[PDB]
Amino acid sequence: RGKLPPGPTPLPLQIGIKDISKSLTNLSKVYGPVFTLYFGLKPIVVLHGYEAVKEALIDLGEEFSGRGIFPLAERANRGFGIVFSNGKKWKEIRRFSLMTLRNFGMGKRSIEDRVQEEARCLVEELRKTKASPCDPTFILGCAPCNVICSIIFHKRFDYKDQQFLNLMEKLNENIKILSSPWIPIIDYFPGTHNKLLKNVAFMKSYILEKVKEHQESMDMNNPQDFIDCFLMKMEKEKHNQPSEFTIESLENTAVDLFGAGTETTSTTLRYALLLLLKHPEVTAKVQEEIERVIGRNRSPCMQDRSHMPYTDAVVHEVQRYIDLLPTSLPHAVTCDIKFRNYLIPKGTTILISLTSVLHDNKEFPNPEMFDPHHFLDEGGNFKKSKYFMPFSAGKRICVGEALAGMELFLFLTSILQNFNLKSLVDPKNLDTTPVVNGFASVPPFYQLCFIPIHH
Ligand code: HEM
Numbered sequence: 008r009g010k011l012p013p014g015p016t017p018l019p020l021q022i023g024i025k026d027i028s029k030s031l032t033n034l035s036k037v038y039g040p041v042f043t044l045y046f047g048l049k050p051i052v053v054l055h056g057y058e059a060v061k062e063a064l065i066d067l068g069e070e071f072s073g074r075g076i077f078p079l080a081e082r083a084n085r086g087f088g089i090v091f092s093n094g095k096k097w098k099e100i101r102r103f104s105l106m107t108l109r110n111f112g113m114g115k116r117s118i119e120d121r122v123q124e125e126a127r128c129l130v131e132e133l134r135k136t137k138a139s140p141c142d143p144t145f146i147l148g149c150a151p152c153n154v155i156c157s158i159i160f161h162k163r164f165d166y167k168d169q170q171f172l173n174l175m176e177k178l179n180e181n182i183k184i185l186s187s188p189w190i191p192i193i194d195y196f197p198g199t200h201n202k203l204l205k206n207v208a209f210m211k212s213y214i215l216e217k218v219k220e221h222q223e224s225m226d227m228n229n230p231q232d233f234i235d236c237f238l239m240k241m242e243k244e245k246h247n248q249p250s251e252f253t254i255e256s257l258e259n260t261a262v263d264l265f266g267a268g269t270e271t272t273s274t275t276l277r278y279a280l281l282l283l284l285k286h287p288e289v290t291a292k293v294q295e296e297i298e299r300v301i302g303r304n305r306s307p308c309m310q311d312r313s314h315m316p317y318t319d320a321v322v323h324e325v326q327r328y329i330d331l332l333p334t335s336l337p338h339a340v341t342c343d344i345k346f347r348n349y350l351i352p353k354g355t356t357i358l359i360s361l362t363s364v365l366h367d368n369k370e371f372p373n374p375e376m377f378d379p380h381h382f383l384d385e386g387g388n389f390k391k392s393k394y395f396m397p398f399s400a401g402k403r404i405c406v407g408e409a410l411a412g413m414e415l416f417l418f419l420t421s422i423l424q425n426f427n428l429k430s431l432v433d434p435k436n437l438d439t440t441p442v443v444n445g446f447a448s449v450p451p452f453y454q455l456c457f458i459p460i461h462h
């Protein structure tokens with residue numbers, strides 16, 4: 008009936024995602040690019056190497072577009088948003104969300120507009136540290152969060168506003184819980200499964216409040232944010248019950264956007280500054296390029312990227328090098344499907360090795376080294392690659408891809424346009440080793456001084 012790929016016999020201190028990825032790569036050398044692992048009677052089919060990831064996620068896109076159940080089901084019922092939903096519900100909600108994020112049905116103000124404003128605020132906030140040692144963790148967190156608040160409720164907060172601090176506190180808690188290391192089984196239980204449930208309840212409740220206020224002034228000719236756009240969809244979906252668009256669904260999708268769009272961006276920003284401190288020659292050329300293409304008066308805009316190949320290679324290289332989500336989020340096949348000499352049954356969990364693609368040693372010689380030239384051709388031009396999959400690939404590719412690319416490019420250039428980065432430790436001694444984490448490559452702690460730029 009099914010015939011899964013071969014693998015090690017069943018069941019294969021604190022172990023992180025990077026350790027797991029390393030294990031998966033070692034296993035691919037034994038069993039090949041496609042293999043099965045079992046954790047109990049639970050089989051997980053692993054895809055390793057670009058060719059197998061492409062053939063599955065891209066060439067059989069639909070069949071591999073399902074979401075893998077995960078280490079639990081969340082009776083909070085997370086399955087009504089985008090991240091953990093499946094089927095028809097996922098299909099319509101993901102589509103709606105993609106298009107709204109691409110400026111459709113959200114008013115005339117652009118997404119870039121919002122990101123440029125936050126960029127300006129991020130710079131002002133960084134000026135407030137008065138060039139004294141700073142751990143940028145918090146400030147780099149507020150920026151991405153505020154862009155999602157602006158897109159979802161049409162509101163951005165001061166980084167000192169309690170409401171805003173509360174949302175981030177809850178998000179950080181859930182993220183730290185969901186990404187705890189393993190030791191067989193996850194590692195969290197103490198008093199946690201309930202904090203996850205409660206914090207989510209709190210967040211949904213906070214959003215529902217905003218939803219209630221939007222319903223008061225809802226106007227079919229004036230949506231200006233994600234909530235208006237969603238409420239206008241429900242409107243058009245009435246007389247066609249049961250719709251996938253409901254208040255429960257709007258709040259869960261809103262919660263997904265916050266969770267998926269805050270920490271990933273924030274961690275990549277923090278990792279980028281750390282790689283910039285570590286490689287002062289790279290930073291200097293980014294600053295040179297910023298200086299000659301944009302100058303220091305006007306704010307950076309997305310059109311500048313095509314004229315700044317070194318900086319574009321640097322942003323790509325940060326994402327490629329750090330391998331933020333080594334195994335993406337788990338997938339599942341949507342029906343029984345023949346894949347090479349195998350027969351995978353509907354619902355089988357599929358684990359993708361993004362590390363195996365981002366760190367392919369033939370596409371990116373010396374893949375373990377940080378090097379902007381992994382994205383530069385032999386003439387120094389920007390070189391795009393089919394192996395650049397930090398956002399994954401296929402039908403489940405990060406719905407926030409465009410938004411995240413804008414945040415990384417605009418925030419990084421804004422920061423480098425206004426400040427020189429000064430590391431306390433001598434770069435040569437600066438340790439860039441990732442801290443153990445269950446789902447993500449996270450950078451170690453560091454501080455730096457944001458010194459108003461000078462020459
Ligand atoms: C540097 C930043 C980011 C990176 C590297 C990143 C990466 C990813 C990856 C690897 C996935 C899993 C894809 C899969 O299942 O195969 C994903 C999912 C997703 N991301 Fe992002 N992401 C980032 C930021 C964003 C932003 C800014 C948003 C907000 C709009 C966002 C929203 C989501 C959502 C909602 C999902 C789930 C999509 C689905 O299941 O269909 N992400 N992201």
Ligand SMILES: C[C@H](C(=O)O)c1ccc(-c2ccccc2)c(F)c1
Pocket residue numbers: 085090178181182185203207262263264265266267268271336
């Ligand atoms: C807050 C919410 C939750 O279910 O707890 C939630 C929402 C989205 C993410 C998420 C994180 C990184 C990539 C894709 C999704 C997440 F880790 C947590």
